């Protein structure tokens, strides 16, 4: 789940400093409720290194990384003062799956009782049964209930059967992954290759950070098949960081290499090369990420931080992309494709969960400004039906993580059929970001919370900005674009206005504290609002909230309304205003006493309804952002009132 | 909203026979609305009926028709023994979507405290506010908050400002409708015009039945701008104004289906139309419960028969041929189009969701499925080469009808899938199919859903009848249709097993119904049925979306129904079941009989027989229909008359 390794090559570090670096990396990767973690390093207290390289020591523990860090310093035999000019340490944090949390079942997994090979793994080996039986027939005894141990045992099998005494660490790993089936990200360490690391992935993210006070040989590592590698030019000193997430690297360096499926990256003599079995290469790029972005700060939870910082993340999404003087929108990621997109005949938005709601939330304005048909598909269903896709379709894939399975498989489906693919993602280097022809990084910052908050609103704004590009040549739409863009200009301050009503939301959370259901009703631009709000309250509050399209009430669902059923209705001053007034009269006529989220100046309804949240008025195709935030906050406060940890996931 | 009036010209009927006839006609229309009812007849207790037509009596009460039938009786002032040789009585049941269902807001409305003009109205007047102000200035006092009172107060304004002393009742009504906007179906009665009825319409149904032992003068009344329909040789005739054919079939099968702006009038027992007389293709048995306790139960258990009727004369199993006569002169042009759009509401929308996949498979065209209300809110792009389907049991749903006219304006080819011959949607569509499911009386659609399902499948079988590669697939499906009626009987034989399950859920507040693929519509339709008639908080959840939030709502106390069938999504649905169980859920599973795997590992299962994947949805939804039925009975509710709504939403 969380991989981190630190390789210091001719950068002298003490064992204390090394272990501190490993522990700190796991804290960046540790999320609420990780049960097992461990570290692997060179044991032995012989003065100076080189003699302590043939003693791999493991310290694994069941619990949080805090307990591990205490165990690290709770070692009487170890001396934390030895200095290593060259050393490789690896670490892992996990939520136990194949087995039960126990020190043995934690990572790293070892190849034997002397720890000749150890490995840390993210993923699942589907065929680990066949592999385990084979290794046992060849005489390898197992000790854990994990599929990872088969990896440690298999690499030693390849070593015990090597043809020459100097077969590379890379070759051994290559022979291992050939026998593996499923998804994996791996980092290997061995006494037979002191100071060397090998990292490889298949369907699981893995990256390498590099730092050196000296110039590096290149910024584009070429691939070697079965100048040519990265290394400090005029000196040896260099540091490498393997990790499954940039969060554990950004505080040490912002220069990273994203590995790809079946890449085998190896560090030999302090030099990094990337091998393949099959010119192309892997780029050393600069991440805009910052350590402060993955911290709670003064907020008591990541959910609270990411809700209340939405004035900032919205501004981050638009920076360098909008100009309110000449009313121009420039999404850099679509420069080399915007003209081709405009020659296509249909837009298909494919996503899961809240990302899908972002498409529902912008479907109308995309239809309005592109004038093309716009299909919005749930990825899982999109695949089940084998949806017809064509070469003149443009397919969008909305994914904060860029790794969701069904969305990624939908991407590959549409590529097979020759469609133009576009990514709306929030993770640089992710599978969906790489494999899409083009796209937009919404630049919302890392989303650490359990539920999507700023990602939904940054996706929202990103699609609106795209729609504004698609109509930049239409005279008849110049005024509509100005209205929308002046809405984006004012949007950050309007969000602050909504957040300032947090006290009113808590009063609503008190009303619904003891309730077991709540219907959220909306239509038009706010169909997505009531769907997203119902999902948030389900995911965070664990109560039965359901979004109901207002225009469907009189077709059945209205039967639920009575004096006891809590109802939240969204009524804004747009073209559907009178229709929403109609639905309100239908609810009240059946003893419903709903709460209404309406515009700040809607004096007509504020005097008729029980309780009303009064959000500020904005352009119709942006109101969804302002009207969903009270539902974000409502889920947060309800969960807190009930003693729940909003940063602790339940689905798992 | 239903209309019914009884005019017996020279056919002696006592005041008890007329009132019993008015109430009996409303009961035939009660399913179109049951929040209030009323009647309007002649008062006074004079043996000579001629000296009583100057006194109008209104009896209106809140509740169903049974509340009115008891209010009409046990009255100390109305002598039910007066013989009327000529009399006109109007009645009306109301679906109070707004305001209170009080007697004052019920119909017939009145023009003054003496009841000089009373009217019954079905629809909405879109400018009743401007008409109310004008009438209030001229000295007319209003009492109710309905839009129908503006029609009663206006016909008196045209009568108080007439040019000649003998302006026909038609002339007065003609001047009224010229000031009315929107849709309406009206039936007037006045003391100045004793026994004279006037029936006009505009966007609302309104027919006139006739019964007479004597020959009728003609069989095609000529419209005006050797003229009237009346008995030859004698005067005995009985008329039956009604907004539906079920209230007239019991007395006669000879009606006159008016058209928009046709002002029918019965003067001296002669029917004339200002500005056909066909036989009804309906039998009385089709609108009778028979041996069942409710119409819904009948219409569920008669699905084996209604499915056969939908295929009658259309599916030939000896040679595996499909021919839908309604699409004969259009099937070739439909194939040259580039997209299908299905537009409907509620259960009719689910019928499209249930057939979207197979339509995509056999036509290879894009298939977009739209909720009518949202389709209109977004101004969805439509083109000339679009084929737009409109699924409507009643053929009068406002939003579905608006979508039709919307698509027609953009030059799309429009196709109707309806169950009511001569309805708005059936007439205004270019072509279509009458599903021939028979009259549906229960508010909740049961046989209409499965008949729409089958009808869209038959269309798909036509669209691929020239593909060699699809021949075996067609035969597979058609064999499934041949076996479908008997498999429905097999499901119905499990009614008792369903009733037992109901006794284990009726006390619960919520139930989650989960499904994917072909059974996404099944869990959406079942959730809607349980909402509508049992008032449980039932929600359908696409199985593939569980891992994206909703799964957090599942615990050992949340009821869950899962649909796991033997199609290509079986392995994925087994994964969902495992997720639900990991969350401590104890789900009820609707699965296939041969699915011994699921049956063994689940204590509560409903085993339905196997069929073709694209037909299984018909068999999987029937248990949920029955479950909703039994749950409602256990909770003490009337399955035919659910609360807060009625059947057919003909007014938005
Ligand atoms: C990742 C990166 O270095 N982005 C830089 C880019 O931002 P810029 O906004 O110009 O472009 P993006 O960050 O949005 O995307 C970067 C590239 O990845 C592609 N892409 C992105 C998302 C996706 O889902 N699929 C996809 O293919 C884009 O088409 C584009 O070619 O120029 C800016 C300078 O003006 C820098 O501040 C940004 O650091
Ligand atoms: C109403 C009628 O007399 N139908 C006859 C017709 O049925 P048949 O099955 O041939 O055609 P339908 O009854 O389904 O429809 C009748 C006509 O109305 C049109 N239409 C129907 C539904 C709709 O929603 N929109 C629309 O425009 C059809 O295109 C068609 O032109 O031939 C059969 C003999 O084989 C007879 O048993 C049916 O009595
Ligand atoms: O709050 C809910 C979750 O965020 C849920 O909606 C879903 O898991 C994502 O929205 C989709 O995942 P990606 O956004 O990473 O594609
Ligand atoms: O059980 C629910 C009802 O059947 C309802 O959903 C109905 O389908 C629509 O309200 C109108 O649709 P029609 O136009 O087909 O009558
Ligand atoms: Mg890319
Ligand atoms: Mg027609």
Tab-separated table of N, CA, C and O in Angstrom, chain B residues 51-141:
chain	number	residue	atom	x	y	z
B	51	UNK	N	-89.657	22.385	-13.150
B	51	UNK	CA	-89.522	23.486	-12.205
B	51	UNK	C	-88.340	23.304	-11.256
B	51	UNK	O	-88.323	23.914	-10.180
B	52	UNK	N	-87.355	22.484	-11.630
B	52	UNK	CA	-86.182	22.244	-10.803
B	52	UNK	C	-84.865	22.553	-11.501
B	52	UNK	O	-83.839	22.652	-10.819
B	53	UNK	N	-84.859	22.711	-12.825
B	53	UNK	CA	-83.619	22.945	-13.554
B	53	UNK	C	-83.012	24.313	-13.275
B	53	UNK	O	-81.908	24.588	-13.758
B	54	UNK	N	-83.693	25.170	-12.518
B	54	UNK	CA	-83.175	26.489	-12.176
B	54	UNK	C	-82.394	26.497	-10.869
B	54	UNK	O	-81.960	27.568	-10.431
B	55	UNK	N	-82.202	25.339	-10.239
B	55	UNK	CA	-81.513	25.238	-8.958
B	55	UNK	C	-80.421	24.188	-9.082
B	55	UNK	O	-80.708	23.024	-9.378
B	56	UNK	N	-79.175	24.597	-8.855
B	56	UNK	CA	-78.016	23.717	-8.961
B	56	UNK	C	-77.530	23.387	-7.556
B	56	UNK	O	-77.411	24.277	-6.706
B	57	UNK	N	-77.246	22.107	-7.321
B	57	UNK	CA	-76.753	21.621	-6.039
B	57	UNK	C	-75.347	21.070	-6.230
B	57	UNK	O	-75.109	20.267	-7.138
B	58	UNK	N	-74.423	21.500	-5.377
B	58	UNK	CA	-73.048	21.021	-5.393
B	58	UNK	C	-72.771	20.240	-4.117
B	58	UNK	O	-73.059	20.719	-3.016
B	59	UNK	N	-72.218	19.040	-4.271
B	59	UNK	CA	-71.814	18.196	-3.151
B	59	UNK	C	-70.359	17.819	-3.401
B	59	UNK	O	-70.071	16.933	-4.213
B	60	UNK	N	-69.442	18.489	-2.711
B	60	UNK	CA	-68.013	18.244	-2.840
B	60	UNK	C	-67.437	17.914	-1.472
B	60	UNK	O	-67.823	18.517	-0.466
B	61	UNK	N	-66.513	16.956	-1.435
B	61	UNK	CA	-65.919	16.540	-0.174
B	61	UNK	C	-64.483	16.091	-0.402
B	61	UNK	O	-64.113	15.661	-1.498
B	62	UNK	N	-63.684	16.198	0.655
B	62	UNK	CA	-62.287	15.791	0.616
B	62	UNK	C	-62.165	14.285	0.812
B	62	UNK	O	-62.886	13.687	1.616
B	63	UNK	N	-61.248	13.676	0.072
B	63	UNK	CA	-60.996	12.250	0.140
B	63	UNK	C	-61.285	11.570	-1.182
B	63	UNK	O	-61.512	12.211	-2.212
B	64	UNK	N	-61.277	10.242	-1.144
B	64	UNK	CA	-61.551	9.446	-2.333
B	64	UNK	C	-63.024	9.599	-2.714
B	64	UNK	O	-63.764	10.411	-2.151
B	65	UNK	N	-63.465	8.801	-3.689
B	65	UNK	CA	-64.856	8.866	-4.124
B	65	UNK	C	-65.776	8.276	-3.065
B	65	UNK	O	-66.930	8.702	-2.927
B	66	UNK	N	-65.295	7.292	-2.299
B	66	UNK	CA	-66.121	6.713	-1.245
B	66	UNK	C	-66.489	7.753	-0.196
B	66	UNK	O	-67.563	7.672	0.409
B	67	UNK	N	-65.615	8.737	0.033
B	67	UNK	CA	-65.958	9.832	0.934
B	67	UNK	C	-67.067	10.698	0.354
B	67	UNK	O	-67.859	11.277	1.107
B	68	UNK	N	-67.143	10.795	-0.975
B	68	UNK	CA	-68.201	11.571	-1.611
B	68	UNK	C	-69.498	10.777	-1.698
B	68	UNK	O	-70.581	11.327	-1.469
B	69	UNK	N	-69.409	9.487	-2.034
B	69	UNK	CA	-70.607	8.658	-2.120
B	69	UNK	C	-71.376	8.655	-0.805
B	69	UNK	O	-72.611	8.591	-0.807
B	70	UNK	N	-70.668	8.727	0.325
B	70	UNK	CA	-71.330	8.790	1.622
B	70	UNK	C	-71.835	10.194	1.931
B	70	UNK	O	-72.812	10.347	2.672
B	71	UNK	N	-71.189	11.223	1.376
B	71	UNK	CA	-71.667	12.587	1.570
B	71	UNK	C	-72.929	12.846	0.757
B	71	UNK	O	-73.828	13.566	1.206
B	72	UNK	N	-73.012	12.269	-0.445
B	72	UNK	CA	-74.214	12.413	-1.262
B	72	UNK	C	-75.411	11.798	-0.550
B	72	UNK	O	-76.496	12.389	-0.492
B	73	UNK	N	-75.233	10.601	0.002
B	73	UNK	CA	-76.303	9.924	0.717
B	73	UNK	C	-76.490	10.552	2.098
B	73	UNK	O	-75.780	11.480	2.494
B	74	UNK	N	-77.462	10.028	2.840
B	74	UNK	CA	-77.811	10.519	4.174
B	74	UNK	C	-77.820	12.046	4.218
B	74	UNK	O	-77.224	12.679	5.092
B	75	UNK	N	-78.513	12.640	3.250
B	75	UNK	CA	-78.774	14.073	3.227
B	75	UNK	C	-80.255	14.308	3.484
B	75	UNK	O	-81.107	13.664	2.863
B	76	UNK	N	-80.555	15.233	4.394
B	76	UNK	CA	-81.923	15.444	4.848
B	76	UNK	C	-82.721	16.362	3.932
B	76	UNK	O	-83.943	16.458	4.094
B	77	UNK	N	-82.072	17.031	2.979
B	77	UNK	CA	-82.744	17.988	2.110
B	77	UNK	C	-82.981	17.465	0.701
B	77	UNK	O	-83.949	17.882	0.055
B	78	UNK	N	-82.132	16.566	0.210
B	78	UNK	CA	-82.231	16.070	-1.159
B	78	UNK	C	-83.115	14.828	-1.177
B	78	UNK	O	-82.732	13.776	-0.656
B	79	UNK	N	-84.296	14.953	-1.775
B	79	UNK	CA	-85.188	13.815	-1.957
B	79	UNK	C	-84.751	13.035	-3.191
B	79	UNK	O	-84.793	13.557	-4.310
B	80	UNK	N	-84.337	11.785	-2.988
B	80	UNK	CA	-83.780	10.962	-4.053
B	80	UNK	C	-84.849	10.232	-4.861
B	80	UNK	O	-84.544	9.212	-5.490
B	81	UNK	N	-86.087	10.730	-4.866
B	81	UNK	CA	-87.191	10.057	-5.535
B	81	UNK	C	-87.788	10.859	-6.682
B	81	UNK	O	-88.704	10.363	-7.349
B	82	UNK	N	-87.304	12.075	-6.937
B	82	UNK	CA	-87.860	12.888	-8.011
B	82	UNK	C	-87.461	12.288	-9.352
B	82	UNK	O	-86.289	11.959	-9.581
B	83	UNK	N	-88.437	12.143	-10.244
B	83	UNK	CA	-88.205	11.583	-11.569
B	83	UNK	C	-87.841	12.707	-12.531
B	83	UNK	O	-88.593	13.677	-12.673
B	84	UNK	N	-86.692	12.572	-13.189
B	84	UNK	CA	-86.203	13.557	-14.147
B	84	UNK	C	-86.241	12.955	-15.544
B	84	UNK	O	-85.522	11.990	-15.826
B	85	UNK	N	-87.076	13.526	-16.415
B	85	UNK	CA	-87.094	13.103	-17.811
B	85	UNK	C	-85.926	13.696	-18.589
B	85	UNK	O	-85.432	13.067	-19.532
B	86	UNK	N	-85.476	14.892	-18.212
B	86	UNK	CA	-84.309	15.529	-18.813
B	86	UNK	C	-83.478	16.115	-17.681
B	86	UNK	O	-83.985	16.910	-16.882
B	87	UNK	N	-82.208	15.725	-17.607
B	87	UNK	CA	-81.342	16.180	-16.530
B	87	UNK	C	-79.891	16.072	-16.975
B	87	UNK	O	-79.543	15.228	-17.805
B	88	UNK	N	-79.053	16.939	-16.409
B	88	UNK	CA	-77.619	16.939	-16.666
B	88	UNK	C	-76.892	16.984	-15.332
B	88	UNK	O	-77.114	17.900	-14.533
B	89	UNK	N	-76.033	15.999	-15.092
B	89	UNK	CA	-75.222	15.966	-13.890
B	89	UNK	C	-73.748	15.825	-14.207
B	89	UNK	O	-73.364	14.954	-14.993
B	90	UNK	N	-72.916	16.672	-13.609
B	90	UNK	CA	-71.480	16.665	-13.858
B	90	UNK	C	-70.759	16.245	-12.584
B	90	UNK	O	-71.197	16.541	-11.467
B	91	UNK	N	-69.642	15.544	-12.763
B	91	UNK	CA	-68.852	15.036	-11.652
B	91	UNK	C	-67.374	15.168	-11.991
B	91	UNK	O	-66.999	15.368	-13.148
B	92	UNK	N	-66.533	15.055	-10.963
B	92	UNK	CA	-65.097	15.232	-11.151
B	92	UNK	C	-64.302	14.825	-9.916
B	92	UNK	O	-64.613	15.253	-8.800
B	93	UNK	N	-63.274	14.002	-10.111
B	93	UNK	CA	-62.310	13.675	-9.069
B	93	UNK	C	-61.010	14.414	-9.362
B	93	UNK	O	-60.632	14.584	-10.525
B	94	UNK	N	-60.327	14.851	-8.308
B	94	UNK	CA	-59.231	15.803	-8.426
B	94	UNK	C	-57.941	15.220	-7.861
B	94	UNK	O	-57.946	14.578	-6.806
B	95	UNK	N	-56.840	15.446	-8.579
B	95	UNK	CA	-55.493	15.160	-8.087
B	95	UNK	C	-54.909	16.489	-7.618
B	95	UNK	O	-54.404	17.276	-8.421
B	96	UNK	N	-54.980	16.734	-6.310
B	96	UNK	CA	-54.534	17.998	-5.726
B	96	UNK	C	-53.018	17.969	-5.588
B	96	UNK	O	-52.469	17.572	-4.558
B	97	UNK	N	-52.329	18.400	-6.647
B	97	UNK	CA	-50.875	18.494	-6.596
B	97	UNK	C	-50.422	19.693	-5.775
B	97	UNK	O	-49.347	19.655	-5.163
B	98	UNK	N	-51.224	20.755	-5.744
B	98	UNK	CA	-50.939	21.946	-4.960
B	98	UNK	C	-52.046	22.169	-3.939
B	98	UNK	O	-53.143	21.614	-4.047
B	99	UNK	N	-51.739	22.995	-2.942
B	99	UNK	CA	-52.713	23.386	-1.943
B	99	UNK	C	-53.411	22.222	-1.272
B	99	UNK	O	-52.991	21.068	-1.404
B	100	UNK	N	-54.502	22.522	-0.537
B	100	UNK	CA	-55.253	21.509	0.187
B	100	UNK	C	-56.332	20.901	-0.705
B	100	UNK	O	-56.898	21.587	-1.563
B	101	UNK	N	-56.649	19.601	-0.531
B	101	UNK	CA	-57.748	18.969	-1.273
B	101	UNK	C	-59.115	19.222	-0.639
B	101	UNK	O	-59.909	18.303	-0.442
B	102	UNK	N	-59.387	20.483	-0.320
B	102	UNK	CA	-60.611	20.846	0.370
B	102	UNK	C	-61.790	20.878	-0.598
B	102	UNK	O	-61.609	20.948	-1.816
B	103	UNK	N	-63.020	20.823	-0.079
B	103	UNK	CA	-64.186	20.917	-0.971
B	103	UNK	C	-64.222	22.204	-1.773
B	103	UNK	O	-64.683	22.197	-2.923
B	104	UNK	N	-63.740	23.313	-1.204
B	104	UNK	CA	-63.772	24.589	-1.913
B	104	UNK	C	-62.877	24.534	-3.143
B	104	UNK	O	-63.194	25.114	-4.189
B	105	UNK	N	-61.747	23.835	-3.041
B	105	UNK	CA	-60.832	23.697	-4.166
B	105	UNK	C	-61.212	22.559	-5.104
B	105	UNK	O	-60.569	22.400	-6.147
B	106	UNK	N	-62.224	21.770	-4.763
B	106	UNK	CA	-62.669	20.680	-5.616
B	106	UNK	C	-63.658	21.191	-6.659
B	106	UNK	O	-64.217	22.285	-6.542
B	107	UNK	N	-63.867	20.381	-7.686
B	107	UNK	CA	-64.790	20.697	-8.760
B	107	UNK	C	-66.097	19.939	-8.573
B	107	UNK	O	-66.142	18.923	-7.874
B	108	UNK	N	-67.200	20.403	-9.186
B	108	UNK	CA	-67.317	21.575	-10.064
B	108	UNK	C	-67.220	22.908	-9.328
B	108	UNK	O	-67.793	23.062	-8.249
B	109	UNK	N	-66.493	23.858	-9.910
B	109	UNK	CA	-66.478	25.219	-9.398
B	109	UNK	C	-67.808	25.901	-9.712
B	109	UNK	O	-68.693	25.334	-10.360
B	110	UNK	N	-67.955	27.138	-9.245
B	110	UNK	CA	-69.181	27.893	-9.455
B	110	UNK	C	-68.837	29.341	-9.772
B	110	UNK	O	-67.748	29.828	-9.459
B	111	UNK	N	-69.793	30.026	-10.401
B	111	UNK	CA	-69.617	31.421	-10.779
B	111	UNK	C	-70.187	32.391	-9.755
B	111	UNK	O	-69.779	33.557	-9.734
B	112	UNK	N	-71.112	31.942	-8.911
B	112	UNK	CA	-71.728	32.810	-7.917
B	112	UNK	C	-72.387	31.941	-6.856
B	112	UNK	O	-72.479	30.719	-6.993
B	113	UNK	N	-72.852	32.595	-5.790
B	113	UNK	CA	-73.462	31.876	-4.678
B	113	UNK	C	-74.748	31.165	-5.079
B	113	UNK	O	-75.209	30.287	-4.343
B	114	UNK	N	-75.335	31.521	-6.222
B	114	UNK	CA	-76.546	30.874	-6.706
B	114	UNK	C	-76.273	29.775	-7.724
B	114	UNK	O	-77.211	29.078	-8.124
B	115	UNK	N	-75.022	29.606	-8.152
B	115	UNK	CA	-74.634	28.551	-9.086
B	115	UNK	C	-75.360	28.714	-10.426
B	115	UNK	O	-76.184	27.894	-10.832
B	116	UNK	N	-75.027	29.813	-11.105
B	116	UNK	CA	-75.537	30.033	-12.454
B	116	UNK	C	-74.697	29.310	-13.497
B	116	UNK	O	-75.209	28.957	-14.565
B	117	UNK	N	-73.417	29.084	-13.207
B	117	UNK	CA	-72.525	28.368	-14.113
B	117	UNK	C	-71.549	27.557	-13.278
B	117	UNK	O	-70.821	28.123	-12.457
B	118	UNK	N	-71.536	26.242	-13.483
B	118	UNK	CA	-70.594	25.347	-12.822
B	118	UNK	C	-69.810	24.603	-13.892
B	118	UNK	O	-70.366	24.218	-14.927
B	119	UNK	N	-68.517	24.402	-13.641
B	119	UNK	CA	-67.615	23.815	-14.623
B	119	UNK	C	-66.676	22.841	-13.925
B	119	UNK	O	-66.299	23.030	-12.765
B	120	UNK	N	-66.300	21.791	-14.650
B	120	UNK	CA	-65.299	20.827	-14.208
B	120	UNK	C	-64.145	20.870	-15.201
B	120	UNK	O	-64.367	20.836	-16.417
B	121	UNK	N	-62.919	20.947	-14.683
B	121	UNK	CA	-61.743	21.244	-15.490
B	121	UNK	C	-60.641	20.231	-15.221
B	121	UNK	O	-60.376	19.878	-14.068
B	122	UNK	N	-60.001	19.770	-16.295
B	122	UNK	CA	-58.819	18.914	-16.222
B	122	UNK	C	-57.677	19.624	-16.935
B	122	UNK	O	-57.717	19.801	-18.156
B	123	UNK	N	-56.661	20.027	-16.175
B	123	UNK	CA	-55.508	20.702	-16.739
B	123	UNK	C	-55.089	21.915	-15.935
B	123	UNK	O	-55.294	21.963	-14.719
B	124	UNK	N	-54.499	22.903	-16.604
B	124	UNK	CA	-54.067	24.138	-15.960
B	124	UNK	C	-54.305	25.296	-16.919
B	124	UNK	O	-54.097	25.168	-18.130
B	125	UNK	N	-54.746	26.425	-16.371
B	125	UNK	CA	-54.851	27.676	-17.111
B	125	UNK	C	-53.609	28.492	-16.774
B	125	UNK	O	-53.429	28.924	-15.630
B	126	UNK	N	-52.747	28.699	-17.767
B	126	UNK	CA	-51.458	29.342	-17.539
B	126	UNK	C	-51.562	30.846	-17.315
B	126	UNK	O	-50.531	31.482	-17.072
B	127	UNK	N	-52.759	31.429	-17.388
B	127	UNK	CA	-52.940	32.864	-17.194
B	127	UNK	C	-54.126	33.150	-16.282
B	127	UNK	O	-54.782	34.186	-16.415
B	128	UNK	N	-54.416	32.244	-15.343
B	128	UNK	CA	-55.545	32.451	-14.444
B	128	UNK	C	-55.331	33.643	-13.520
B	128	UNK	O	-56.305	34.164	-12.968
B	129	UNK	N	-54.083	34.085	-13.339
B	129	UNK	CA	-53.827	35.252	-12.502
B	129	UNK	C	-54.294	36.532	-13.185
B	129	UNK	O	-54.899	37.399	-12.544
B	130	UNK	N	-54.020	36.670	-14.485
B	130	UNK	CA	-54.501	37.834	-15.221
B	130	UNK	C	-56.017	37.809	-15.369
B	130	UNK	O	-56.651	38.870	-15.414
B	131	UNK	N	-56.611	36.617	-15.449
B	131	UNK	CA	-58.064	36.514	-15.530
B	131	UNK	C	-58.721	36.784	-14.183
B	131	UNK	O	-59.844	37.300	-14.137
B	132	UNK	N	-58.046	36.446	-13.083
B	132	UNK	CA	-58.614	36.694	-11.764
B	132	UNK	C	-58.652	38.186	-11.453
B	132	UNK	O	-59.626	38.678	-10.871
B	133	UNK	N	-57.607	38.922	-11.835
B	133	UNK	CA	-57.592	40.364	-11.604
B	133	UNK	C	-58.674	41.062	-12.417
B	133	UNK	O	-59.423	41.893	-11.889
B	134	UNK	N	-58.769	40.741	-13.709
B	134	UNK	CA	-59.780	41.369	-14.555
B	134	UNK	C	-61.181	41.133	-14.008
B	134	UNK	O	-62.003	42.056	-13.966
B	135	UNK	N	-61.472	39.903	-13.579
B	135	UNK	CA	-62.805	39.590	-13.078
B	135	UNK	C	-63.069	40.246	-11.727
B	135	UNK	O	-64.207	40.639	-11.444
B	136	UNK	N	-62.041	40.374	-10.885
B	136	UNK	CA	-62.221	41.035	-9.597
B	136	UNK	C	-62.541	42.515	-9.767
B	136	UNK	O	-63.250	43.093	-8.935
B	137	UNK	N	-62.034	43.142	-10.830
B	137	UNK	CA	-62.310	44.556	-11.054
B	137	UNK	C	-63.744	44.785	-11.513
B	137	UNK	O	-64.339	45.819	-11.192
B	138	UNK	N	-64.315	43.838	-12.257
B	138	UNK	CA	-65.678	43.972	-12.757
B	138	UNK	C	-66.731	43.624	-11.713
B	138	UNK	O	-67.927	43.730	-12.009
B	139	UNK	N	-66.327	43.216	-10.516
B	139	UNK	CA	-67.252	42.939	-9.443
B	139	UNK	C	-67.518	41.477	-9.164
B	139	UNK	O	-68.612	41.146	-8.693
B	140	UNK	N	-66.560	40.594	-9.435
B	140	UNK	CA	-66.712	39.164	-9.196
B	140	UNK	C	-65.827	38.762	-8.023
B	140	UNK	O	-64.607	38.954	-8.066
B	141	UNK	N	-66.442	38.207	-6.982
B	141	UNK	CA	-65.725	37.796	-5.783
B	141	UNK	C	-65.320	36.332	-5.901
B	141	UNK	O	-66.137	35.483	-6.275
